[PDB]
mmCIF file of C-alpha atoms and ligand atoms in Angstrom:
data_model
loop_
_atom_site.group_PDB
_atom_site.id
_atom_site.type_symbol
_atom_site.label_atom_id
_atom_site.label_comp_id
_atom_site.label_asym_id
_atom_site.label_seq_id
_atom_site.Cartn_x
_atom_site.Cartn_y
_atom_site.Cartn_z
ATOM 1 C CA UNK A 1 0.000 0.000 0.000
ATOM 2 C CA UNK A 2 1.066 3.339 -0.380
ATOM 3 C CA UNK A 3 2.132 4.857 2.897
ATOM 4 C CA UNK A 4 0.160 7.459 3.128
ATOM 5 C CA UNK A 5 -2.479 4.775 3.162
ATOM 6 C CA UNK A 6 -0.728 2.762 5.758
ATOM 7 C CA UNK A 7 -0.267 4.722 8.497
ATOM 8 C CA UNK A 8 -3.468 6.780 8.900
ATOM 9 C CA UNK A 9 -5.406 3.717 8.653
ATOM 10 C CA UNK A 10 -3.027 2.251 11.241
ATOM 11 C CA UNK A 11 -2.582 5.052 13.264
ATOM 12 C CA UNK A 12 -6.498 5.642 13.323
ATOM 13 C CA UNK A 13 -7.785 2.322 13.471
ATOM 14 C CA UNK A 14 -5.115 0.404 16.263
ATOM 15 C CA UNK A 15 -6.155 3.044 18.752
ATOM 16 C CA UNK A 16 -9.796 2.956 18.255
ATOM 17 C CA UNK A 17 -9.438 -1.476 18.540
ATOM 18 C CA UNK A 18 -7.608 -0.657 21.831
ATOM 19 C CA UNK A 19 -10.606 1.792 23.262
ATOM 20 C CA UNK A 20 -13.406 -0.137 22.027
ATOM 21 C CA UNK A 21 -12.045 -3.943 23.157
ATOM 22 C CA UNK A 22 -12.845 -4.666 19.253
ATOM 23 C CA UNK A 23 -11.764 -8.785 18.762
ATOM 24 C CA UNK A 24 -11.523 -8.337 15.096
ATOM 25 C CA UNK A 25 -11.592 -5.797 12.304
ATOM 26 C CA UNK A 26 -11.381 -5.922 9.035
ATOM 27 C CA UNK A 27 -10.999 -2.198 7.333
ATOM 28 C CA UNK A 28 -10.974 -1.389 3.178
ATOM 29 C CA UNK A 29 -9.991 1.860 2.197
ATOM 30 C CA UNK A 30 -10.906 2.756 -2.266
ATOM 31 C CA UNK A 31 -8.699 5.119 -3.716
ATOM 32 C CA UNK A 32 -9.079 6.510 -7.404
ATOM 33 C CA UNK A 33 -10.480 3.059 -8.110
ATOM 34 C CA UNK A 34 -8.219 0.656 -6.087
ATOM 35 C CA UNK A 35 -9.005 -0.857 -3.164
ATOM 36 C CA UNK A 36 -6.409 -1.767 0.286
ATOM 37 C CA UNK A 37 -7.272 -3.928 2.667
ATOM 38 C CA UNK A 38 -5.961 -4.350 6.486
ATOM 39 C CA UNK A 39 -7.479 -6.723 9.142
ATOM 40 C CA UNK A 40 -7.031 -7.160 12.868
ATOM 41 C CA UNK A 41 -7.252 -10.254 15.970
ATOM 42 C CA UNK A 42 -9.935 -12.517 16.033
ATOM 43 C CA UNK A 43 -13.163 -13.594 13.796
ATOM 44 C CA UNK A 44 -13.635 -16.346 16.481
ATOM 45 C CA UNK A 45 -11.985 -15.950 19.429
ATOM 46 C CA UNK A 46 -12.020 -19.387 21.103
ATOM 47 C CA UNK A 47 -10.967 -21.290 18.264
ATOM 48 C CA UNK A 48 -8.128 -18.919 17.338
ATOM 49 C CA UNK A 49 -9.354 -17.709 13.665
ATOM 50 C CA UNK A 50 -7.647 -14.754 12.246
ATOM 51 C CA UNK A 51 -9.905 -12.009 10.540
ATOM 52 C CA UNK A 52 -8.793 -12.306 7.257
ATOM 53 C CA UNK A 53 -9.740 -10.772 3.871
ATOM 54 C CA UNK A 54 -11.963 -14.038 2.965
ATOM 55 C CA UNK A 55 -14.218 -13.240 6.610
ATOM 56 C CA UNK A 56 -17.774 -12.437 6.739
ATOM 57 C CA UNK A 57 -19.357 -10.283 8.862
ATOM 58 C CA UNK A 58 -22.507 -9.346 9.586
ATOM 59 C CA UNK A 59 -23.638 -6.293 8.242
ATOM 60 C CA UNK A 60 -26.695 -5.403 9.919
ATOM 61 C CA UNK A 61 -28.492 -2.622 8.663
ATOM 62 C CA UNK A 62 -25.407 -1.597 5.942
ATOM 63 C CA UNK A 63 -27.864 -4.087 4.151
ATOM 64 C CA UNK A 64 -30.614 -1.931 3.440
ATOM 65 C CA UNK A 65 -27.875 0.231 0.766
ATOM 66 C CA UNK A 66 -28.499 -3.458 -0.857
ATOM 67 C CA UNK A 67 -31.710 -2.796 -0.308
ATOM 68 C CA UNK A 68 -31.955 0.121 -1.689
ATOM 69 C CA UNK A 69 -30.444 -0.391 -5.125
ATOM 70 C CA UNK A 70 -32.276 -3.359 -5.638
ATOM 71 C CA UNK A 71 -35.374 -1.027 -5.384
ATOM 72 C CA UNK A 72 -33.694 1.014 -7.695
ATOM 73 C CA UNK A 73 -33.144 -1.503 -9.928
ATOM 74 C CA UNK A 74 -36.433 -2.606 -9.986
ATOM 75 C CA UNK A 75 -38.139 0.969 -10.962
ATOM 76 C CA UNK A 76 -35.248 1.147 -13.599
ATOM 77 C CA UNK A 77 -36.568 -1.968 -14.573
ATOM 78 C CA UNK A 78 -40.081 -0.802 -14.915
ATOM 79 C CA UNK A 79 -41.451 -3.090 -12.492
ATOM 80 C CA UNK A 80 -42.247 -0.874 -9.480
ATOM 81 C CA UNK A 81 -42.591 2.817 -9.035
ATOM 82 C CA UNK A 82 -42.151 4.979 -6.214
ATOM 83 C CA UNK A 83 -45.038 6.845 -6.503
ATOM 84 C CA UNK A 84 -47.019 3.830 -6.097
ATOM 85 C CA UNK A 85 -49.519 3.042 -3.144
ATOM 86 C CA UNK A 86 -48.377 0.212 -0.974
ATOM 87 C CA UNK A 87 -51.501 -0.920 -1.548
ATOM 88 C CA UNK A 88 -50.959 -1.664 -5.210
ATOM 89 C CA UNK A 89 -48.577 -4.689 -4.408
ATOM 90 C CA UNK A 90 -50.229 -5.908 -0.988
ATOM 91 C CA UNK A 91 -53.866 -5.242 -2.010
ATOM 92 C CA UNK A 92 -54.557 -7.299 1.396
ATOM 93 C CA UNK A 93 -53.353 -4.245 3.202
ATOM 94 C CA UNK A 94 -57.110 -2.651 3.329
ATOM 95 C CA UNK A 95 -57.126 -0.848 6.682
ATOM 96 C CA UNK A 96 -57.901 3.327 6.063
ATOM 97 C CA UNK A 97 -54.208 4.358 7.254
ATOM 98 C CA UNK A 98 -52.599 3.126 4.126
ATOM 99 C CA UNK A 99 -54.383 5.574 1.415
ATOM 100 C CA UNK A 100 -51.717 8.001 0.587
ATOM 101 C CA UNK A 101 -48.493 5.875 1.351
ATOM 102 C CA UNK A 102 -46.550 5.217 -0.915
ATOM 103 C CA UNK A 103 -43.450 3.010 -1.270
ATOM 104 C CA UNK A 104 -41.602 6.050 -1.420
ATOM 105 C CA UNK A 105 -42.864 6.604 2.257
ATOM 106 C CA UNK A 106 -41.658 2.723 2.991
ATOM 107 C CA UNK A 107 -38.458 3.413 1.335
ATOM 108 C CA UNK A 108 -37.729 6.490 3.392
ATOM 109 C CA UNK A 109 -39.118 5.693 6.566
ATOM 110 C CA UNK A 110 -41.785 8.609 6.379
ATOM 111 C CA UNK A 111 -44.698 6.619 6.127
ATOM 112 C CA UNK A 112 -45.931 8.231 9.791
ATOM 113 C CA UNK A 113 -43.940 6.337 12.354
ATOM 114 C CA UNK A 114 -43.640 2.580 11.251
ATOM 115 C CA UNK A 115 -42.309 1.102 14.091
ATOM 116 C CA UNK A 116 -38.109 0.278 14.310
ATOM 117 C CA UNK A 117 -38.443 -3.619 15.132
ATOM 118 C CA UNK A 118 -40.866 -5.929 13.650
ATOM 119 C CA UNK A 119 -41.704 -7.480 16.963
ATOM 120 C CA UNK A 120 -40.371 -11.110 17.703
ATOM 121 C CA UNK A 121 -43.703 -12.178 17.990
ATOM 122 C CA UNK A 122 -44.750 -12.043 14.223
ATOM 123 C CA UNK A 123 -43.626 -14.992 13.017
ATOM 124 C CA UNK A 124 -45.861 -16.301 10.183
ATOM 125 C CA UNK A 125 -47.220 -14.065 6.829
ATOM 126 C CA UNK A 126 -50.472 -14.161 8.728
ATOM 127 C CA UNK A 127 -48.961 -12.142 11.932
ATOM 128 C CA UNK A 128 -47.036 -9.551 9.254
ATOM 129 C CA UNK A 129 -50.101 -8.477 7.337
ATOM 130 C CA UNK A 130 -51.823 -8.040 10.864
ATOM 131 C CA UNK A 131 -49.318 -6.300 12.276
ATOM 132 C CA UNK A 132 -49.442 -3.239 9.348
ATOM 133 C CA UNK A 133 -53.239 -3.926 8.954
ATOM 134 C CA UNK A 134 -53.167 -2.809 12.605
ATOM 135 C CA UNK A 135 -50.481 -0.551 13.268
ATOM 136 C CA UNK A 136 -51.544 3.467 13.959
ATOM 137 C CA UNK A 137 -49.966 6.143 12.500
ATOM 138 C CA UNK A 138 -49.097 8.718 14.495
ATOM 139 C CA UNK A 139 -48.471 11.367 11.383
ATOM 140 C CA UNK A 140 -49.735 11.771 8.323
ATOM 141 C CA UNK A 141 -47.220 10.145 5.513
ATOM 142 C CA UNK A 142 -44.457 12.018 4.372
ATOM 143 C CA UNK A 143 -44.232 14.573 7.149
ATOM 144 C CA UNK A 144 -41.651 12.747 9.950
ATOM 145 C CA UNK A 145 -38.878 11.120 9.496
ATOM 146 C CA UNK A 146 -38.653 7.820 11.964
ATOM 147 C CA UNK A 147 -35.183 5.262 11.180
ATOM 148 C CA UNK A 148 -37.512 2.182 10.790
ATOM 149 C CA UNK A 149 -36.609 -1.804 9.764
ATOM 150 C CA UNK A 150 -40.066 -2.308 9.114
ATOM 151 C CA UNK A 151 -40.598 0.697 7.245
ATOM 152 C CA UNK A 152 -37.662 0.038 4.177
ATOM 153 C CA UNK A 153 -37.966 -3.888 5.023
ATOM 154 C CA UNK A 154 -41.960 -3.842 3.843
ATOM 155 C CA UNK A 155 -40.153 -1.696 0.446
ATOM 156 C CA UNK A 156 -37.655 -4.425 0.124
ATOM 157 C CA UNK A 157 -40.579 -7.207 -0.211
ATOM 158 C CA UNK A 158 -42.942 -5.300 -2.368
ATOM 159 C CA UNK A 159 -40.510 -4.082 -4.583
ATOM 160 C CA UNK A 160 -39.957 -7.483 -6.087
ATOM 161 C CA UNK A 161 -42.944 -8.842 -6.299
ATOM 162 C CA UNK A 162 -43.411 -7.918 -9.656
ATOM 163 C CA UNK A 163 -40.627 -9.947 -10.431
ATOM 164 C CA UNK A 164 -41.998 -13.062 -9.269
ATOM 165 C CA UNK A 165 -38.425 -14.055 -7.768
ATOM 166 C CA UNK A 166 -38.145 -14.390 -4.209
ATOM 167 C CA UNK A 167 -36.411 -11.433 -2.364
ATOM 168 C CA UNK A 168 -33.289 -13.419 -1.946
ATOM 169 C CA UNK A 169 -33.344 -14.810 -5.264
ATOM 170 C CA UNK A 170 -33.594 -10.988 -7.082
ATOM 171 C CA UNK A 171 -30.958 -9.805 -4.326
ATOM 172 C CA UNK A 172 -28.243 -12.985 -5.616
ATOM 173 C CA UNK A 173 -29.429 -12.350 -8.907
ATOM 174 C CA UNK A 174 -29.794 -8.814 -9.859
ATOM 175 C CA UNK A 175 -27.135 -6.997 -7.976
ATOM 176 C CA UNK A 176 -24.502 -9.679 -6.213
ATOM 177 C CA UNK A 177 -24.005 -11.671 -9.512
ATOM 178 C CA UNK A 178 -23.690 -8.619 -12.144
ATOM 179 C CA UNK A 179 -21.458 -6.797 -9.569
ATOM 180 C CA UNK A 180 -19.400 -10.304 -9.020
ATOM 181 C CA UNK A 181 -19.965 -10.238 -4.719
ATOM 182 C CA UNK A 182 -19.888 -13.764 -4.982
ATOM 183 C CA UNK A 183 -19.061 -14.091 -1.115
ATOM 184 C CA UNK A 184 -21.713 -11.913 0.060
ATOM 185 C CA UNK A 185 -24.855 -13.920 1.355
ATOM 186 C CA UNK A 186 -28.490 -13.223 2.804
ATOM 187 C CA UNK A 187 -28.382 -17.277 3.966
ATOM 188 C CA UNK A 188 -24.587 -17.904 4.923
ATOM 189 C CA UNK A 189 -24.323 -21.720 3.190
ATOM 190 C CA UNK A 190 -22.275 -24.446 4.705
ATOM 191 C CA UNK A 191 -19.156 -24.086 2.558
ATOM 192 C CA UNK A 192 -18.665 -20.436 3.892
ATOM 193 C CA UNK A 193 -19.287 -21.158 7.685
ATOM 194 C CA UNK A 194 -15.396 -21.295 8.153
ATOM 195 C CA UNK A 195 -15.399 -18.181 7.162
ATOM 196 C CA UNK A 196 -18.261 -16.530 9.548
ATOM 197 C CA UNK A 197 -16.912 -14.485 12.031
ATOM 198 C CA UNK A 198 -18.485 -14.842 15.486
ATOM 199 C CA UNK A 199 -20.532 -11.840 16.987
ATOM 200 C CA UNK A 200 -19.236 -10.771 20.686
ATOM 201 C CA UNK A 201 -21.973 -9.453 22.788
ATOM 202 C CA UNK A 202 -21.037 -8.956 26.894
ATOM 203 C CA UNK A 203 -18.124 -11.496 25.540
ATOM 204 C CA UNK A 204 -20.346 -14.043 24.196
ATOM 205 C CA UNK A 205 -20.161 -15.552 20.588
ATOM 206 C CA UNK A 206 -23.767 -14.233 19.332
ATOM 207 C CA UNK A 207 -25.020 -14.305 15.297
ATOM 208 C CA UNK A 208 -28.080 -12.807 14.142
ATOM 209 C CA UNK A 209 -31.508 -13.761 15.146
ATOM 210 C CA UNK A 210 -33.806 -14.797 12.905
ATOM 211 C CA UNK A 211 -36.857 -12.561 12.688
ATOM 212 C CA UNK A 212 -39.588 -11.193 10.002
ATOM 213 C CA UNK A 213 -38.218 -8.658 7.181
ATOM 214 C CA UNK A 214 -34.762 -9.770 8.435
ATOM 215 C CA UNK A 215 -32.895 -9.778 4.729
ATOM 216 C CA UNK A 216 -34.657 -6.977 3.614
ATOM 217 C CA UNK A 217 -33.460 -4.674 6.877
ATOM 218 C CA UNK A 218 -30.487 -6.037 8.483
ATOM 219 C CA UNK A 219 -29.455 -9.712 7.346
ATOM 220 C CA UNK A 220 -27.015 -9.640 4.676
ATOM 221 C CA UNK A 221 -23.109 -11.020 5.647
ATOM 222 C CA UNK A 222 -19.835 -10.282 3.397
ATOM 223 C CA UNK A 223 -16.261 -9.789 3.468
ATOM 224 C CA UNK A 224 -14.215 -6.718 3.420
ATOM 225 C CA UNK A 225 -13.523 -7.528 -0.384
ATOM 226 C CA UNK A 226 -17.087 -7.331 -1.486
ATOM 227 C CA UNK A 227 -17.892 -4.257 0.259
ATOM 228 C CA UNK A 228 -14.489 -2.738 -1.369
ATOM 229 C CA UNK A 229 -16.667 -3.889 -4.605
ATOM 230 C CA UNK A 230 -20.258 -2.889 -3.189
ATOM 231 C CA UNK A 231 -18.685 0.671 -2.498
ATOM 232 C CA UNK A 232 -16.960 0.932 -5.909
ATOM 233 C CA UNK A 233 -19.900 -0.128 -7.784
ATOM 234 C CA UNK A 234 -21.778 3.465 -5.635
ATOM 235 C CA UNK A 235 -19.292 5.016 -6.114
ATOM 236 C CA UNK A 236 -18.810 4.704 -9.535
ATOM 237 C CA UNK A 237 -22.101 3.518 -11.535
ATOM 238 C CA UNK A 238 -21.278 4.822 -14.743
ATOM 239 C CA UNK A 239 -18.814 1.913 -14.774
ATOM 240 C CA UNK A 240 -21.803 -0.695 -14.508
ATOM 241 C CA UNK A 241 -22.453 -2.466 -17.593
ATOM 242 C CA UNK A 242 -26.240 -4.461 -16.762
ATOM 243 C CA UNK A 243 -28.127 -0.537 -17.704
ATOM 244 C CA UNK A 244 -30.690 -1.102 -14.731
ATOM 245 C CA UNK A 245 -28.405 -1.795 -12.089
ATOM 246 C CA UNK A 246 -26.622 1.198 -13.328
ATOM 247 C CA UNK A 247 -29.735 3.298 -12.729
ATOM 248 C CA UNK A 248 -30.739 1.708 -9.373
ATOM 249 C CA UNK A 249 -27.571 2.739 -7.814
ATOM 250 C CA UNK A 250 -28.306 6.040 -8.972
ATOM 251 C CA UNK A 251 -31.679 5.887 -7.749
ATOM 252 C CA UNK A 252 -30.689 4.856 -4.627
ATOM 253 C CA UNK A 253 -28.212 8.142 -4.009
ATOM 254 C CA UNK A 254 -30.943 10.609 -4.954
ATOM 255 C CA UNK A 255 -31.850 13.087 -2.424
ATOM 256 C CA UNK A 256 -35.744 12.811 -1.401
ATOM 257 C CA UNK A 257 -36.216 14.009 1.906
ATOM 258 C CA UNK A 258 -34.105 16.917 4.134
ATOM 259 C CA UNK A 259 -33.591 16.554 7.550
ATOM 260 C CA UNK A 260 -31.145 18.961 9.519
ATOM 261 C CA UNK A 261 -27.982 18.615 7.416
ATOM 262 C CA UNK A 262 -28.809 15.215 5.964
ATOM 263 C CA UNK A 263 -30.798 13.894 2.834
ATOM 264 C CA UNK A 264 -32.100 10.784 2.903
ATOM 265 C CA UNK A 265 -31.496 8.442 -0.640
ATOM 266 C CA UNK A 266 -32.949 4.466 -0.548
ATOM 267 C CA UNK A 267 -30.939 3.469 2.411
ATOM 268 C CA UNK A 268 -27.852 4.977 1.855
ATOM 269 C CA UNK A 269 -28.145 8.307 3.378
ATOM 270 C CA UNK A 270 -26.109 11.756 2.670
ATOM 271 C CA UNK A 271 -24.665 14.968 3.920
ATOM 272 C CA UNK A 272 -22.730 17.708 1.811
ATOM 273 C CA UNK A 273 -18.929 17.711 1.453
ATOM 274 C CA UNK A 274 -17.109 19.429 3.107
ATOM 275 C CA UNK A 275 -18.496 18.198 6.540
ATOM 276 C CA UNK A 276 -17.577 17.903 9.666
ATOM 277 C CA UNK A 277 -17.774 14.712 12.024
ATOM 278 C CA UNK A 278 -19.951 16.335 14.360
ATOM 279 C CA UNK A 279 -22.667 17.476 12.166
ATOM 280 C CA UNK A 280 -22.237 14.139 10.443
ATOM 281 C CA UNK A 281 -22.984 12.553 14.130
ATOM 282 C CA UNK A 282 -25.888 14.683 15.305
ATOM 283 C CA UNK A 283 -27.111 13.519 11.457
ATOM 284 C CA UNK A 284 -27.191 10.001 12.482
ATOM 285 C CA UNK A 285 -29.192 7.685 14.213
ATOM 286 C CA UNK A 286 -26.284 6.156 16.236
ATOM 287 C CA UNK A 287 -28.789 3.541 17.714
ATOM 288 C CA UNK A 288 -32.033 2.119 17.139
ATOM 289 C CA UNK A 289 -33.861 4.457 19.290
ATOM 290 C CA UNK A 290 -37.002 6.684 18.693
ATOM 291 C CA UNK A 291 -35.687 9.812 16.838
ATOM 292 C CA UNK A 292 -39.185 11.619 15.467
ATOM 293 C CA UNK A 293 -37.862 14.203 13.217
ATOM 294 C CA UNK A 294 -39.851 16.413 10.438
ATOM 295 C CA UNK A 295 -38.886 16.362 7.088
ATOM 296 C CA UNK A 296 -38.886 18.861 3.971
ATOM 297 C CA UNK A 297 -39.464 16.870 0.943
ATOM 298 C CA UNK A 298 -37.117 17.821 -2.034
ATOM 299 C CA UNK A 299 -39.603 18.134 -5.045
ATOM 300 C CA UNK A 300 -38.280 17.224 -7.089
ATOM 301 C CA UNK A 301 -35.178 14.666 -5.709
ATOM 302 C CA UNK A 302 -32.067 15.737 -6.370
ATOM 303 C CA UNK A 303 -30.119 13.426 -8.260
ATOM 304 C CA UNK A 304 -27.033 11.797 -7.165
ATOM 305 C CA UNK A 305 -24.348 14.519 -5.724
ATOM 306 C CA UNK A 306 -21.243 13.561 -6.552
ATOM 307 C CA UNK A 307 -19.376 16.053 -3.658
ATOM 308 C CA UNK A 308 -21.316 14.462 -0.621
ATOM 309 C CA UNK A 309 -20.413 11.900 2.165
ATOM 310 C CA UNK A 310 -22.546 9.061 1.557
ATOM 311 C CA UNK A 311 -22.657 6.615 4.403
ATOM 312 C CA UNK A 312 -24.725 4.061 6.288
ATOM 313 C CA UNK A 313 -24.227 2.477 10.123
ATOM 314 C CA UNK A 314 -24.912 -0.878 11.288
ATOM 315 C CA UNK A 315 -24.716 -2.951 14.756
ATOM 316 C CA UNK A 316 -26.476 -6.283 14.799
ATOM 317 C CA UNK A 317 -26.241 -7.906 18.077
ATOM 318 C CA UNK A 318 -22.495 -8.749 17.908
ATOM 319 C CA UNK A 319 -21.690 -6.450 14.883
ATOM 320 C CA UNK A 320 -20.603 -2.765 14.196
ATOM 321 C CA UNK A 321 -20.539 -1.969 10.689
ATOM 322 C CA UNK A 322 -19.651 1.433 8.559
ATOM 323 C CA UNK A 323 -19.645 2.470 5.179
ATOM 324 C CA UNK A 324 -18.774 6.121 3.739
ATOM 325 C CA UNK A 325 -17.693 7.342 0.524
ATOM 326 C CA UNK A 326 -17.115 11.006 -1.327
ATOM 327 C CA UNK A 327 -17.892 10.759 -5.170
ATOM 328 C CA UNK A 328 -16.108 13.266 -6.635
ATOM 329 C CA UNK A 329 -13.032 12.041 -4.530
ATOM 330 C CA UNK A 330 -13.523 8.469 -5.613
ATOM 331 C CA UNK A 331 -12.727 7.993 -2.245
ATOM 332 C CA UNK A 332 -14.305 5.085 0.023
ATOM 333 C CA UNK A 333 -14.051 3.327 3.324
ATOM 334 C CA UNK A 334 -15.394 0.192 4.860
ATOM 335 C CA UNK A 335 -15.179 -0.710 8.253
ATOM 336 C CA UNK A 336 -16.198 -4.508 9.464
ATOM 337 C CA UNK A 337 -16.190 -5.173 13.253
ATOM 338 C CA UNK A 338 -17.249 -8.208 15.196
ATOM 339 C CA UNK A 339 -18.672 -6.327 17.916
ATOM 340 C CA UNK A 340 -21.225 -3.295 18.035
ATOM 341 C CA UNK A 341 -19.203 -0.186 19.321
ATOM 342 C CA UNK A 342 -20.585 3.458 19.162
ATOM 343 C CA UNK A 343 -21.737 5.126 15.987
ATOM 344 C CA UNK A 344 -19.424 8.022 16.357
ATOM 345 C CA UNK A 345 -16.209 6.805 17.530
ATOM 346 C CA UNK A 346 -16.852 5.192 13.867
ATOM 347 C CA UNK A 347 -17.556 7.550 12.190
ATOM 348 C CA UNK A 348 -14.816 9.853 13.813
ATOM 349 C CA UNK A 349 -12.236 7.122 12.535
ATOM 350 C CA UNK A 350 -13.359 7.109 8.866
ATOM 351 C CA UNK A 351 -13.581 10.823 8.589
ATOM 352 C CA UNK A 352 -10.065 10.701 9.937
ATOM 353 C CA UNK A 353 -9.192 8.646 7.420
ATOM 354 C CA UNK A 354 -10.852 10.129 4.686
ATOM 355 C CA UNK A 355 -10.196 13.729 5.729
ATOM 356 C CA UNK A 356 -6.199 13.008 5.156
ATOM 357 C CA UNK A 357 -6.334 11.152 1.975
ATOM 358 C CA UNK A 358 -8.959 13.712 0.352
HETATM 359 O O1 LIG B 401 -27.797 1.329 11.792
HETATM 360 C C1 LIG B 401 -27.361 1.187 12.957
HETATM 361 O O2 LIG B 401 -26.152 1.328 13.242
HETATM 362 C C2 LIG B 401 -28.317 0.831 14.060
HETATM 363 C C3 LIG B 401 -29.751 1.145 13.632
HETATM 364 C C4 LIG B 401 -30.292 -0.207 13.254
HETATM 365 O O3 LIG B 401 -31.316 -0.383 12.612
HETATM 366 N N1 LIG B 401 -29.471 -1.134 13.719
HETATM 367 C C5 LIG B 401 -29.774 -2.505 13.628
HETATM 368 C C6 LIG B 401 -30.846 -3.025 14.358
HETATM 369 C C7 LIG B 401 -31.162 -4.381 14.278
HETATM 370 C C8 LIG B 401 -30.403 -5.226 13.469
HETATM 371 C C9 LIG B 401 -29.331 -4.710 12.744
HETATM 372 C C10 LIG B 401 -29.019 -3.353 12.820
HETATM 373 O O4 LIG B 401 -27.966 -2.875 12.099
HETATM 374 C C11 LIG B 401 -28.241 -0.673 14.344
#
């Protein structure tokens, strides 16, 4: 790597394993289209595995960039459109509150206060319908902002039903194949287990639960190497050759909703550059805890900025994941831990990072 490279990643990152009691780490920093890897301790701690570039990790709600652009892909595709009523794809969903949301408002998580968690207790497609058939909105749609799994996780599922393909199957299909993540799962299968870092909650080896809308709002797993790709591919679409994968990224990065300094795209979300950690923290939700905000709609969304920090958090159980990247930098950073430390400590160490190499 060039040194430059080396030692602020080192220098940043070494510290920040030391504070946080992180077991292992695996970091990717993209420059000008090239990608440089570094890894720390343990992926499993009792039976001595290394984190290595080949580890997965669990990427908790990073997934719903995925997401996102597969939403994307499926407007570009014709199928779905974001103007559409939720309604129009789960016709079953007849209760009053639903006229007037859209899947934009599912996308965005301004449908009126979806709730964060699907609770544990829906467990069949019987208990899901119920659950939105019955939920209460506290606002009208697209006036509040509310960070919500089973807000974008309902998008995910609707969005390719058109498609006939199960949500998995269009995920594998329509973005992880053309974009060659081909160790990037929503099911982690038995010849990658080796390979599947262990979670460390209170020190104990955790993985994700299994719960309703879990691929579509926090359950995808993959290495530092495919996120070097996943980020490259956002970073730079144009480079994309399948033409509605291109535009779903795009999609994805467009600017639909204002709230304080941040826009929010389909799941990735996005501040101006120049910024400064703080205001990229206080534009965060740095847990999964009730943060009712109003939002200014952008009519009509801006399309993709290419000077902005586009980023997206996530902690699973045992997990703390981070992803940022600057456009018209063609800079990026991914940050893989097997433990769920504070939002801002990471995203003080990636604009650290990114800051000197800009
Ligand atoms: O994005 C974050 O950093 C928080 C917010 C959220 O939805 N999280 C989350 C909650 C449940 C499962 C996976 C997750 O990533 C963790």
């Amino acid at each position: 790597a060039p040194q430059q490279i080396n030692d602020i990643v080192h220098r940043t990152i070494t510290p920040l394993i030391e504070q946080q009691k992180i077991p292992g780490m695996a970091v990717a920093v993209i420059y000008q289209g090239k990608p440089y890897y570094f890894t720390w301790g343990y992926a499993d701690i009792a039976k001595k595995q290394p984190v290595t570039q080949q580890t997965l990790f669990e990427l908790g709600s990073v997934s719903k960039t995925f997401t996102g652009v597969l939403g994307g892909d499926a407007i570009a595709r014709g199928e779905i459109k974001l103007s559409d009523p939720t309604t129009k794809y789960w016709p079953e969903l007849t209760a009053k509150q639903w006229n007037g949301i859209t899947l934009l408002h599912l996308a965005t998580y301004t449908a009126g206060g979806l709730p964060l968690q699907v609770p544990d207790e829906v467990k069949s497609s019987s208990d899901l319908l119920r659950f939105y058939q019955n939920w209460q909105p506290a606002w009208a749609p697209g006036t509040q902002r509310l960070y919500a799994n089973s807000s974008i996780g309902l998008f995910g599922a609707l969005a390719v039903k058109p498609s006939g393909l199960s949500f998995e199957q269009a995920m594998q299909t329509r973005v992880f194949q053309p974009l060659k993540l081909n160790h990037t799962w929503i099911n982690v299968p038995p010849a990658e287990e080796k390979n599947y870092a262990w979670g460390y909650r209170e020190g104990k080896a955790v993985h994700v639960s299994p719960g309703a809308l879990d691929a579509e709002a926090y359950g995808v797993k993959s290495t530092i190497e495919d996120m070097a790709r996943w980020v490259q591919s956002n970073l730079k679409p144009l480079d994309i050759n399948e033409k509605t994968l291109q535009q779903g990224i795009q999609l994805a990065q467009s600017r639909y909703w204002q709230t304080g300094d941040m826009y929010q795209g389909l799941g990735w979300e996005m501040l101006d550059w120049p910024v400064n950690p703080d205001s990229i923290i206080n534009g965060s939700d740095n847990k999964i805890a009730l943060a009712a905000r109003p939002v200014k709609a952008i009519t009509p969304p801006t399309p993709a900025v290419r000077a902005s920090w586009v980023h997206k958090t996530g902690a699973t159980g045992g997990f703390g994941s981070y992803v940022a990247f600057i456009p018209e930098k063609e800079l990026g950073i991914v940050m893989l831990a097997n433990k769920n430390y504070p939002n801002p400590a990471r995203v003080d160490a990636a604009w650290q990072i990114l800051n000197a190499l800009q």
